[PDB]
Design a binder for this molecule. Structure first.
Ligand code: NA
Ligand code: NA
Length: 318
DNA sequence: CCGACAGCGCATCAGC
DNA sequence: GCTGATGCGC
DNA sequence: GTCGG
């Protein structure tokens, strides 16, 4: 963190500007990817040319690094920070439900601060009101100890609805992370293959675990939950996905991550003669044509098809 | 030089 | 009202 | 913004 922290903070701040103000999502992911590869770089960068050797860092970023290492700042960023419009737009996107488009809309109307939002809740949809209500709590990290407690509640209540259910808490948590930003739960049932989600949500609301709802459909749920007290715990964001039984363990593998791990596994699968997405793993023909989905009854089955040794979730960082 | 870069599920918006 | 586009989260 | 056809 003390190695190239100044560079990674710069690229991250540049990433947010492109996403929120410029609305250039591909430039946003470009800076983050660069900020990521520099973070894992075990040396203190001395020049843009050194970082240029890394994948994801091109000419423009190398040029920016050179300026930062010589001046301690970036003229582009300093002018962006002092810009009233850009800073206000970039900040409002921190509210869940407010993206680049809505933030641009609000700032143009004069709505630039968190207080201005509260004075204009008639201009906000349901999601934005909830995001505003739990603004502070949503930016808080969820310690693993609390994630375990949340997991106990979810697994207990899901089983009380129907013992035939299968629930898996994925994300960085399943990889053994010390903290999380949210809770992603994958759900399935033998009767559902390629009104089960409602019953689970209702039960979690019955024990007052789920407090609010952002979106709710037949296969996907996003809302707000909170751990019971005896100091009251912060409200956390929870997502619950209903996945078909024949596509469940492919989904588990997908949402467990990491993003880099999935990229490598998809690459290794292609060399073995298989293709893997979020839903299914299919064999490839001699002309590149994919066949019918392969039977998956376990996460270890997918590793067996591609002749790969089973990777523990804790060892899926890359 | 120039397109890819993940894209799906849900809520809301724009047009008919 | 329906249908498709847009916006947003992940 | 970077990478690769
Ligand atoms: Na490079
Ligand atoms: Na937001």
């Amino acid at each position: 963190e003390t190695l190239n922290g100044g560079i990674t903070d710069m690229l991250t701040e540049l990433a947010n500007f492109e996403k929120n103000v410029s609305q250039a999502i591909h430039k946003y992911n470009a800076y983050r990817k660069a900020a990521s590869v520099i973070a894992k770089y075990p040396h203190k960068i001395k020049s843009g040319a050194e970082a240029k050797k890394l994948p994801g860092v091109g000419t423009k970023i190398a040029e920016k690094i050179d300026e930062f290492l010589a001046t301690g700042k970036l003229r582009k960023l300093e002018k962006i920070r002092q810009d009233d419009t850009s800073s206000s737009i970039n900040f409002l996107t921190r509210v869940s439900g407010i993206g680049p488009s809505a933030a641009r809309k609000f700032v143009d109307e004069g709505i630039k601060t968190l207080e201005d939002l509260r004075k204009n809740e008639d201009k906000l949809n349901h999601h934005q009101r909830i995001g505003l209500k739990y603004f502070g709590d949503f930016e808080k990290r969820i310690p693993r100890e609390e994630m375990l407690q949340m997991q106990d509640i979810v697994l207990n209540e899901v089983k009380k609805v129907d013992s035939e259910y299968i629930a898996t808490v994925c994300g960085s948590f399943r990889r053994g992370a010390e903290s999380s930003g949210d809770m992603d739960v994958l759900l399935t049932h033998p009767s559902f293959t390629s009104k089960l989600l409602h019953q689970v949500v209702e039960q979690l609301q019955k024990v007052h675990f789920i407090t609010d709802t952002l979106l709710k459909g037949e296969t996907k749920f996003m809302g707000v939950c909170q751990l019971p007290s005896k100091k009251e715990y912060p409200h956390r964001r929870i997502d619950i996905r209903l996945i078909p039984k024949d596509q469940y363990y492919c989904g588990v593998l997908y949402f467990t991550g990491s993003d880099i791990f999935n990229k490598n596994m998809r690459a290794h699968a292609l060399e073995k003669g298989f293709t893997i997405n979020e839903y299914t793993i299919r064999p490839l023909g001699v002309t590149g044509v994919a066949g019918e989905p392969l039977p998956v009854d376990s996460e270890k089955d997918i590793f067996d098809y591609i002749q790969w040794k089973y990777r523990e979730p804790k060892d899926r960082s890359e």
